[PDB]
RNA sequence: UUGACAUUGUGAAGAGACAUAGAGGGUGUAGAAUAAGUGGGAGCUUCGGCGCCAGUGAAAUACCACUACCUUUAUAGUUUC
RNA sequence: GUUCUUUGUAAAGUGCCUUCGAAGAGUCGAGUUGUUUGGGAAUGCAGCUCUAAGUGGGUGGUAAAUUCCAUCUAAAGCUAA
RNA sequence: UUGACCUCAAAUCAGGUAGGAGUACCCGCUGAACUUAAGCAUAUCAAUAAGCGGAGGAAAAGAAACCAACCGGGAUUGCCUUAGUAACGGCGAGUGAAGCGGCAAAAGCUCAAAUUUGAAAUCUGGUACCUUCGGUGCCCGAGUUGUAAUUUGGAGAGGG
């Protein structure tokens, strides 16, 4: 059972020597090969926030640019379409809408190679705003596979309670055993080590 | 270390290193039988003891396990046998003798 | 409870220690008589569980037997029948090697009432077994409310008939819808349904 | 068992009064027991592994279990045996090699 | 008569996978500069070395976990010829 | 029917609480060879190699994989009419 | 060097037990031919005669790793039925069950697997005496690589 060691409990809230917030990363080991069809490319919805300083550039209009400045990082418009087309890019991802289909051609020339644009297979265009801002500042994080049998990403912070982290890795461990094919090998849940940035890594 | 059926004795030393009691292999199952008014026994247990020899008993326990209990996990990766006879020792060792250091 | 350890021990035959002793024993018997009695069972576990009490009236007999098949006794492969019934090599037998060794020890030990044996050795040209017979004339056993049936004339040559477990396995007198091939006497059940039973009153 | 009271059905039969007596041991002839537990583990450590048992863990760790159940059905008989048999294999793979 | 498997074992060497801890290396033009390479990152840190916001490029560096390919680079154990 | 000796600090069984309850392996089963059979992807039997397990296991008459239900107690012997 | 152990012998030592017959009938292994197919090779006759091994008064078989799929029954034999049917088969000539049901018949159990362990209490034989299908005292040996008692799953044992 998960509640003795850390993983997302307590333990590593004293082994730290850093004063600034450190984002932990969950390291897995799911037995898979060079195939594409057999694997997970899904995203586990985390209920609690990661408090990540990953600024955004979401350009909206009408009843979509009101609940913008309350849960995220920055507030844009359809005219502020001549700010991120020049010499400044620090953002990690963007977000548009349906009313923003006409004004979606002046933002694709700077986001193709890196991929921070609004697409057909990329989470960005949605009409009802106030709902997806609890999944952007909370960091939903995407899961992908390079070529073999392992997976790493970003979970939460090491300064939150023991029960504010146990409900975040409950539906993140369930997505790494459900979306993953049985077209795999022995146990999809084996080694399970976890480190932040410097400290140690505990397994269960 | 006798008994034709050696399979009747190869499980005793393992059950001993699992409980924590002293064991000692003697070289005579026929002798283990005459001190018990029999022919052969091979098996000799010591359960109830008197307040006479209890002292000379803990000293012996130490010498015994000193040789068997501890080197148990040791010779568990060591193979016995493979000793050649006179004809094969000399001819074959005087072969690896006069091909290197002659 | 040494018997429990010895029993799961005789099931780890694919281990390094078991391959050792069955390779040591098998050979020493190959330099002895083919038909040579044994003063002590090499398997206390198997011996006793079948039926073995240490005393004057229980003899063990070490038996080394050959294998292969049974070539028909025809001069140069010369048969004189129909193509179907005209082979010599894929010629088996209707009895097991266990039952065969008993037949030969009952001819040497004609005075003992054979009981049951077991599997011990086997390499390539020879298979090994060791059977146990009883004393139908010894006083200590002639009595005893366990073996008073040994002195009854109805057991003389149990292997020539098949009153043994290996004989009742090779015969097939067990319970089953598949065992209804000869559930009750080979040619007995045969002659039975293959006979015309008519009464004074034909209905 | 509570049927349907008619000819056929998902419970094809009559609804008569139930009785149910005491339990039987003619159902536990293959039980756990503290006696057989002690005995069977003790002998697995004394003899070691067989030739294919070495190459069994080697074809799991290195390749797969779809591969172990594939060659275990060739070494034995059933897929049902491969189930509990190859299941028991990884019981020692984990509870020993790492933990 | 010929192939295979059992019988049928206990070693050395030459290629030979692989547990496991370290060490290690690869795009041209260019940006001081070693690029298939993602994110955490304004600090790990008395030293201040890199920073960094900046910036040239297709990809931006330490606290570096490692999604890591890969090293016939070697070790501590099993392998087919 | 009569009649000798009390067999005895002799054993078995009934009601209640708790812990246990050990039960047969080169056997089972598989591929295959032949042969038998009402038996039909295989009824049995012997041979060959392989080679089990314990909330197990055999059987449920179309194999097979998948999730269940049922039903017995093998690989020990004896017993009249 | 004396004394045990295991193992293999020895005799006109002591005590025993095996053989062939008979073979109507029952248990096995091996095993045909004719015959049919209007021919004839798988098929059939036949899972037959002979042949060789083996006992009894009967024997063999037997208390399920049984049959079912029932409102489940419940060892073994046997007659009636199933039926000339399910089935098999150059789907040819042909061959070929079983469950259930009725009834005569009707007996149940015991060994290993448990620490008798505050006691190998058990058994062979020699000998003495006797009430002799045998008993009791002694002297040896088997046997601890395990003889009495408890217990066989339907239970059951230890503690109380």
Q: Which residues pair with C65 in a beta bridge?
A: C127
Q: Nearest by CB to C12, which of D35, D43, D51?
A: D43
Map residue C128 onto helix, strand or coil: strand
Q: Any CB–CB contact under 8 A between D47 and chain B?
A: no
C1-203: CATH topology is Ribosomal protein L15e (3.40.1120)
What are the residues whose beta carbons fall under 8 Å from the beta carbon of C97, sequence distance 6 or more? C65, C67, C127, C129
Q: Cα(C99)–Cα(C159) distance, rounded to whole angstroms?
A: 7
Residue D42 with chain C: CB contacts under 8 Å: 5
How far apart are the C-alpha atoms of B48 and B79, rounded to whole Å?
A: 37
In strand G, which positions have an atom below 7 A from any protein CB? 4-8, 15-19, 26-33, 41-44, 47-48, 53-57, 59-62, 64-72, 76-81, 96-99, 110-115, 118, 120, 123-125, 141-148, 153-155
Tell me the pairing of strands A193-195 and C113-116.
Answer: unpaired
Are A95 and A124 contacting, i.e. CB atoms less than 8 angstroms apart?
Answer: yes
Residue of A nearest to D60 (CA): A186
Chains that touch D (3 or more CB pairs under 8 A): A, B, C
Nearest Cα residue in chain D from A187: D65
Helices D68-75 and D79-97, interaxial angle, to 10°? 120
Chain D residues close to A186, C-beta within 8 Å? 60, 64-65, 90
How many whole angstroms separate alpha carbon D92 and alpha carbon D98?
A: 10
List bases in chain F with any atom under 7 Å of a protein Cβ: 20-30, 33-39, 43-58, 60-61, 64-66, 72-73, 75-79
B5-35 burial, b at 16+ Cβ within 10 Å, e below that, comes to bebbbbbebeebbeeeebbeeeeebeebbee
Experimental method of this PDB entry:
cryo-EM
Domain ranges of chain C: 1-203
Three-state SS at C183:
coil
Task: Tell me the fold of D16-99.
Answer: Arc Repressor Mutant, subunit A (1.10.10)
Phi, psi of C18, rounded to the nearest 5 degrees? -80, -35
**What residue spans define the domains of chain D?**
16-99
Place of tokens 């418009």: A77
Q: Which of C117, C157, C126, C153 is nearest to C137 (CA)?
A: C153
Documented resolution in Å: 6.1
Give the C-alpha distances (Å, rounded to integers) separating A75 from A59, A61, A80, A84.
7, 11, 10, 13
Q: Please give the structure tokens belonging to residue A110.
A: 């700077």
C14 touches strand G (CB under 7 A): no
Give the pair of three-digit tokens for residue A69. 């400045």
């Amino acid at each position: 059972v998960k509640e003795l060691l850390k993983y997302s409990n307590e333990t590593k809230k004293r082994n730290f020597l850093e004063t600034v917030e450190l984002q932990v990363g969950l390291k897995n080991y799911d037995p898979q090969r060079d195939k594409r069809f057999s694997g997970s490319l899904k995203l586990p919805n985390c209920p609690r926030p990661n408090m990540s300083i990953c600024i955004f550039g979401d350009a909206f209009d009408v009843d979509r640019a009101k609940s913008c400045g309350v849960d995220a990082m920055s507030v844009d418009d359809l005219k502020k379409l001549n700010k991120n087309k020049k010499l400044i890019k620090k953002l990690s991802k963007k977000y548009n809408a349906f009313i923003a289909s006409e004004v979606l051609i002046k933002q694709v020339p700077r986001l193709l190679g890196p991929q921070l644009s609004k697409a057909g297979k990329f989470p960005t265009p949605v009409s009802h705003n106030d709902d997806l801002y609890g999944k952007v500042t909370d960091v939903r994080s995407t899961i992908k596979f390079q070529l073999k049998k392992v997976l790493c990403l970003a979970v939460a912070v090491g300064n939150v309670e023991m029960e504010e982290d146990v409900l975040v890795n409950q539906i993140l461990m369930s997505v790494n055993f459900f979306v993953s094919l049985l077209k795999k090998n022995w146990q999809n849940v084996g080694s399970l080590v976890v480190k932040s940035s410097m400290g140690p890594a505990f397994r269960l | 270390n006798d008994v034709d059926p050696i399979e009747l004795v190869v499980f005793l030393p393992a059950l001993c290193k699992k409980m924590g009691v002293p064991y000692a292999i003697v070289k005579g199952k026929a002798r283990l039988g005459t001190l018990v008014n029999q022919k052969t026994s091979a098996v000799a247990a010591l359960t109830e003891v008197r307040a006479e020899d209890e002292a000379a008993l803990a000293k012996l326990v130490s010498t015994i396990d000193a040789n068997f209990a501890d080197k148990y996990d040791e010779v568990k990766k060591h193979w016995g046998g493979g000793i050649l006879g006179n004809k094969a020792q000399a001819k074959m060792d005087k072969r690896a003798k006069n091909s290197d250091s002659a | 409870g040494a018997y429990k350890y010895l029993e799961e021990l005789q099931r780890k035959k694919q281990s390094d220690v078991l391959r050792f002793l069955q390779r040591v024993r098998v050979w020493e018997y190959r330099q002895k008589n083919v038909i040579h009695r044994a003063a002590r069972p090499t398997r206390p576990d198997k011996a006793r569980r079948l039926g073995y009490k240490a005393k004057q009236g229980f003899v063990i007999y070490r038996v080394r037997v050959r294998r292969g098949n049974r070539k028909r006794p025809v001069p140069k492969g010369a048969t004189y029948g129909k193509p179907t019934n005209q082979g010599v090599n894929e010629l088996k037998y209707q009895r097991s090697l266990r039952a065969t060794a008993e037949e030969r020890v009952g001819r040497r030990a004609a005075n003992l009432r054979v009981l049951n044996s077991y599997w011990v050795n086997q390499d390539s040209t020879y298979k090994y077994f060791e059977v146990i017979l009883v004393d139908p004339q010894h006083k200590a056993i002639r009595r005893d409310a366990r073996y008073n049936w040994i002195c009854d004339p109805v057991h003389k040559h149990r292997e020539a008939r098949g009153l043994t477990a290996t004989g009742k396995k090779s015969r097939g007198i067990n319970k089953g819808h598949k065992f209804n091939n000869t559930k009750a006497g080979r040619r007995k059940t045969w002659k039975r349904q293959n006979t015309l039973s008519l009464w004074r009153y034909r209905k | 068992t509570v049927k349907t009271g008619i000819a056929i059905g998902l419970n094809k039969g009559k609804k008569v009064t139930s009785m149910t007596p005491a339990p039987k041991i003619s159902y536990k002839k293959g039980a756990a027991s503290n006696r057989t537990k002690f005995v069977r583990s003790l002998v697995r450590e004394i003899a070691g592994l067989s030739p294919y048992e070495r190459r069994l863990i080697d074809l799991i760790r290195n390749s797969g279990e779809k591969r172990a159940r594939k060659v275990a059905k060739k070494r034995l008989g059933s897929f049902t045996r491969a189930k509990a048999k190859v299941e028991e294999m990884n019981n020692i793979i984990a509870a020993s090699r790492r933990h």
